[PDB]
Amino acid sequence: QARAGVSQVLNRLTFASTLSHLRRLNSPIGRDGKLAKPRQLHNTLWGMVCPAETPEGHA
Amino acid sequence: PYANQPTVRITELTDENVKFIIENTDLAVANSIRRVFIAEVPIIAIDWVQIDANSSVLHDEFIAHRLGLIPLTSDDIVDKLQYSRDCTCEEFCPECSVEFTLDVRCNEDQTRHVTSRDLISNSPRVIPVTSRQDDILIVKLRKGQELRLRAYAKKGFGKEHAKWNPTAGVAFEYDPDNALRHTVYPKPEEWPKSEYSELDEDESQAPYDPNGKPERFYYNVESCGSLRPETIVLSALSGLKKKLSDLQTQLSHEIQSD
């Protein structure tokens, strides 16, 4: 009944990966939702969230 | 219906590289000799390392790799030794290989620099490049660590692995002026003149020449230090001649058998 993936294994494959993983976010919206507003890069994310780095799969 | 009479002229002879020019020969022969320089040149090198105790911070195989890449002077030994594959004995016999030993252990407080100078060779002439300019750094040891091993070196050629690649870099170049148009410059003015260019500074490239064959090949063979440059060239010519002789003998036997 609770959330999943809140605590992940730190991917120690390279220092860049370690930094990225230690400084990551994750939205609680359901996986693979039909809507497309929350996924789009909103304007307010200027200088707060990298506009380039992000997965390319379903998430 | 026969071969040609190529001529040779050396422009710069040193103990590190040779710049020569070959005239009146075919581009195919030129390029083949180049590829022989790089690939099929006998030379000695480390190829069988037995590590007995390695407490360094690097992997076990790392030491073997670095030792494999250390050049060994073979000015007069390579022509005498025989390929280990064709030897007619067991174990690396000195007649067909050269033995090395390395035993260092950092005792004092300051960090050691295990250099190629530690490779104590049994033979006098087969030694790393330190006769006459630091020495090839192998690994660094700290107080408490040690490295004990012994290796055998054998004869091979670059085609098998890079370790047998005597030449550092061959500079091959013919027809400095783009006379044969084998390359088409979109904007000739924008390109710099070749080192061997006889063309003045006004004209960008020589005029076209329909009935013109490539000649005057310029070579800048640069020895890594193992073999002398001219020695590399002589060995390459002899090896190519031997390959052609063997091919001719095989063909004669085949025709006779048919």
Binding site: - | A3, Q5, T7, I10, T25, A28, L234, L247, Q250
Partner: protein
């Protein structure tokens, strides 16, 4: 894990022939020579020498597949001049030329050193 060893590029395997002659059927006086464990080094020079020869109507080699160590040289001469003797003459004259080049290079070096 399946990487081939490095000695398979030049060393012959037991039973493999270094050179094999195969007569072609499409045109008269045409043969394909197949060479095992070689590369462009030993084919391009032969091709150029055959081209130099005038009695050779056609001459040319190829590498059936880069990972495979094999080359095919096709030769076709006039009806009065067999490709076997064409090949033999090309190799002979190429060897003579290489020997002469070596001799000239050696004399040039020995003169360059303090001369």
């Amino acid at each position: 894990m399946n990487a081939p060893p490095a000695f398979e590029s030049f060393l012959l395997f037991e039973g493999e022939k270094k050179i094999t002659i195969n007569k072609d059927t499409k045109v008269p006086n045409a043969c394909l020579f197949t060479i095992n464990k070689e590369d462009h080094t030993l084919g391009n020079i032969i091709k150029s020498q055959l081209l130099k020869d005038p009695q050779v109507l056609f001459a040319g080699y190829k590498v059936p597949h880069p990972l495979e160590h094999k080359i095919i040289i096709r030769v076709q001469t006039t009806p009065d001049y067999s490709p076997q003797e064409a090949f033999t003459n090309a190799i002979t004259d190429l060897i003579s030329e290489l020997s002469l080049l070596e001799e000239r290079f050696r004399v040039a070096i020995k003169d360059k050193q303090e001369g």
